[PDB]
Amino acid sequence: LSNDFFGMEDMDSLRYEKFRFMLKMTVRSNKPFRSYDDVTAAVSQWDNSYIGMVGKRPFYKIIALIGSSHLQATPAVLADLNQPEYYATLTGRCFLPHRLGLIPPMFNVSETFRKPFNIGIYKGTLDFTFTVSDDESNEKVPHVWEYMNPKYQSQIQKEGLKFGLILSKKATGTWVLDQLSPFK
């Protein structure tokens, strides 16, 4: 029931970077996550080690955060309460406001990350496929934050820090990726 556990709804200077993305994210855990901050802790472990495209890493972190908010438990947890699995898929186009400087062009090639996670009470695996590329079309786009599940939109700044994202909203009108943490 959505009341006790996360993801059970289904069961029941400054630059703007314009990009498009696709994500497919699977999380497999030993026990069902009780809350969204348990989920983000697990998901955030995806790049504890990283050999993907250097220039894409910030965008991957961002869409991993966004995508996490959409994770939903599959029936795996009803077959076996001890084999919880969660899935999310999302595609979009948007602006990322950031202070990271010039971003080299990004091409339409996917990268897959398959990694363990261990956050104490919870442990398991992550299987993420991300695609991020420049969006050259003339269609108008939202800010990336508009793709966050509204249920969890209020938790953006705090949960972002788990991903190494230092986000602020001081007099800009929108969340800005001010910097990436050297510690994560």
Number of domains making up the chain:
1
Which residue type is seen at 10?
Answer: D
**How many angstroms separate the first and last alpha carbons of the chain?**
33
Burial class (CB in 10 A: 0-12, 13-18, 19+), 111: middle
Burial class (CB in 10 A: 0-12, 13-18, 19+), 168: middle
Resolution of the structure, angstroms? 1.8
Distances (CA, A) of 61 to 46, 94, 138: 9, 15, 25
Task: Provide the residue range defining the domain that includes 74.
Answer: 1-184
Distances (CA, A) of 131 to 15, 20, 153: 21, 8, 23
What determination technique applies here? X-ray
d(CA 31, CA 12): 18
φ, ψ for residue 26, nearest 5 deg: -115, 135
CATH number of the domain where residue 7 is located: 3.10.460.10
d(CA 21, CA 180): 20
CB 127 within 8 A of CB 85: no
